[PDB]
Subunit: 169 residues, 2 copies
C-alpha cells in the first residue's frame, strides 16, 4: 500500500487532482503546499494527510505578457541560485509562481526587494506570500489539526528550517 | 510529525538525516526522483521514502556556476512554456534541474535542448529519464526489499499517479 501526495501550487488544480484520486479509489491521499490556504482547502475537501512545504518565499508575478513574466522569473532565479536557494517555477495562466527555499531571512528580504524592482522594470504585478518561519508553521499546523488534519508531515531542502521547527515542536 | 528531507544530492541528504537524528527527530523520511539517493537513504536506515515520480532529472557539469545558471535559464524558458513544473538547484560542482507535469513529447524536446545546450555551451549533461509509472513500480519493489517500510509517491501530474494506481 502507498500514500499519494498531490503537490499543488494552485487551489483549483489541487481540488481537481484529489477529486480524480478519490474517483480512482486511492485509500491514502495527501496534499503538499507552501500555501496554507491550499492546505486548508484540502482539509475542508476531506484530505486527512497534509505536507507543509515550509520556509522561504512564494513570489507570484501576474500579467498578460508571458515573455515579461519569464524574463522577471529568470532574473529572480539567477539571484536566488547565487545565494544557494532551491527554486521551483510553474507558469499557470497569467501567473508565474516562484517557490524559493534554503536562504537566510536576510537574503529573503533582498529577494523580496528584487521582486518589487523586477515587477516595475517589466511592468507586471508581483505578490510575495512568503514567511515560512518555524514559529508561523507551528501556529498554522495547530490550525490545520483543528480543521481536521490527522497526519501532518513537514518538508524542506533546508535542514536548518526542519531543525528550528523540530526545536519548536 | 514526520520530517521529510528533500534531496537531489546524496551527500547533503546523509548529512541532513544525521543532523535530524542527533537533534532527536523520531520520524524521518527522504524525498527524491533519484532512485540512487533513495537507495542511499534506506542503506543509512531510513524506513520512509517519498518517490518524486516521473519527468526528467538533468545534471549540468564542467563549467563555472555563472555559466550553469545561464544554461538553467535557457532550459527553464523552454520547460515553462510547455507547462512544466521546474525545480533548479545549484549544487557545488553541478546544476540539477527537475522537470515534471508534461507528456513524453515535451520531455524529448527538453532532453534534446539539454543535449544541444551542453554542446552549444561546451559542458557535460546527464539526462536521467525513466520516469514512467511502470518502472516506478519496479523501483518501489526494489526499495521495499532494500528495507523501505513506508513508500509515499508524489507528483504535480495527477495523470502519472492515476496510471501508477491502475498498474499497482
Ligand atoms: Na478554512
Ligand atoms: Na521540540
Ligand atoms: Na510527475
Ligand atoms: Tb515533496
Amino acid at each position: 500500500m502507498m500514500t499519494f501526495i498531490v503537490w499543488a501550487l494552485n487551489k483549483d488544480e489541487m481540488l481537481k487532482n484529489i477529486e480524480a484520486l478519490r474517483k480512482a479509489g486511492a485509500k491514502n491521499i495527501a496534499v503538499e503546499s507552501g500555501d496554507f490556504d491550499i492546505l486548508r482547502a484540502a482539509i475542508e475537501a476531506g484530505v486527512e494527510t497534509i505536507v507543509v512545504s515550509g520556509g522561504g518565499l512564494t513570489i507570484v508575478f501576474t500579467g498578460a505578457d508571458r515573455a515579461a513574466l519569464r524574463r522577471a522569473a529568470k532574473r529572480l532565479l539567477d539571484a536566488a541560485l547565487e545565494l544557494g536557494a532551491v527554486v521551483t517555477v510553474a507558469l499557470d495562466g497569467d501567473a508565474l509562481r516562484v517557490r524559493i527555499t534554503g536562504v537566510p531571512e536576510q537574503d529573503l528580504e533582498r529577494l523580496r526587494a528584487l521582486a518589487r524592482e523586477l515587477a516595475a522594470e517589466f511592468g507586471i504585478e508581483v505578490e510575495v506570500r512568503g514567511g515560512g518561519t518555524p514559529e508561523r508553521a507551528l501556529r498554522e499546523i495547530q490550525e490545520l489539526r483543528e480543521l481536521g488534519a490527522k497526519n501532518i508531515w513537514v518538508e524542506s531542502a533546508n535542514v536548518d528550517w526542519l531543525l528550528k521547527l523540530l526545536k519548536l515542536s
